[PDB]
Write a protein that binds this ligand. Sequence first.
Ligand SMILES: O=C(O)[C@H]1O[C@H](O[C@@H]2[C@H](O)[C@@H](O)[C@@H](O[C@@H]3[C@H](O)[C@@H](O)[C@@H](O[C@@H]4[C@H](O)[C@@H](O)[C@@H](O)O[C@@H]4C(=O)O)O[C@@H]3C(=O)O)O[C@@H]2C(=O)O)[C@H](O)[C@@H](O)[C@H]1O
Length: 304
Amino acid sequence: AQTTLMLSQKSDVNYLGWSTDESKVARQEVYRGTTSNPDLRERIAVLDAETRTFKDADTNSGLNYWYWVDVVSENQAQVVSNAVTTASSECKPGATFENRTVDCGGVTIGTSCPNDSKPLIILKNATVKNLRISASGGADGIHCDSGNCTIENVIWEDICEDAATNNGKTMTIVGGIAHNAKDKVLQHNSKNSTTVVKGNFTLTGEHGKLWRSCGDCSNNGGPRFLTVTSATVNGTIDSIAGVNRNYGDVATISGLKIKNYKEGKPPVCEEFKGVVKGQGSTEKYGEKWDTTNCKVSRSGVSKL
Ligand SMILES: O=C(O)[C@H]1O[C@H](O[C@@H]2[C@H](O)[C@@H](O)[C@@H](O[C@@H]3[C@H](O)[C@@H](O)[C@@H](O[C@@H]4[C@H](O)[C@@H](O)[C@@H](O)O[C@@H]4C(=O)O)O[C@@H]3C(=O)O)O[C@@H]2C(=O)O)[C@H](O)[C@@H](O)[C@H]1O
């Protein structure tokens, strides 16, 4: 197998994002050192088998750091990633991948962020992994335009418009770090489709919503589904999910951690009235728990 590791430095905190193709994961260990020498690294954490991200806030600046992540299987096999520090050619803006998995090997891409009224990567029943979207060249992020798409270990240094848009059947977010400065992270426009969030997808900075079933799209309708099983918001966010109840949307949220979380701060699942473009405006009903459209108990959300 293989483990590909990437690092994002935001607000004096080091965020690690990795993808692994190991099958029966038992645990994952994070190693950190003050030099390049792997032999001098030390275990600063032993994590569970599902997370694909890690936050190291116990670092002092002025000092460079090297990181490695060791993915261990049930058969105790150890798949150590490449080193990342604070010190393929197919992944370029405007690219379209179809019916395959493209490993971007941790490269950075971007164009620019327009000022008016443009997808960076379009996936048609495909998967993209180990990709970093630059701070200025975000455009309209990643578009899943058909079939099942997986966006694995993608780091958004900043979000220009939308981080990822589900215009397909199923959009799965596995791990990844999404940063934004003052917004829509996951935009869902297709109908009879699902958006899955796991691998502890992490949002940092300032955000609007983690996920929003389009409220006023042209030819709007539903149903649209969201299933969050693992995610973390280490910053401020207006709300987590926005469902159109009149359209049959269902948001199921568990395994979510939020920095300084408190009832209504921020609201998690909110119900709206969806409208067709031009035929009115979208009104917010409010935050809801354990309803037909908002399937999330207070047990599924906790303070980071
Ligand atoms: O004509 C189209 O179909 C259009 O689709 C894409 O754009 C999407 C929406 O059509 C567009 O109006 C916008 O919508 C978002 C959000 O999804 C929508 O619910 C609404 O959000 C309101 C409020 O305006 C926001 O500021 C915030 O407070 O949230 C509110 C809410 O009810 O949740 O308006 C939003 C917005 O204006 O950005 O973006 C949608 C998107 O997928 O990005 C295409 O991008 C567009 O070109 C066109 O094809």
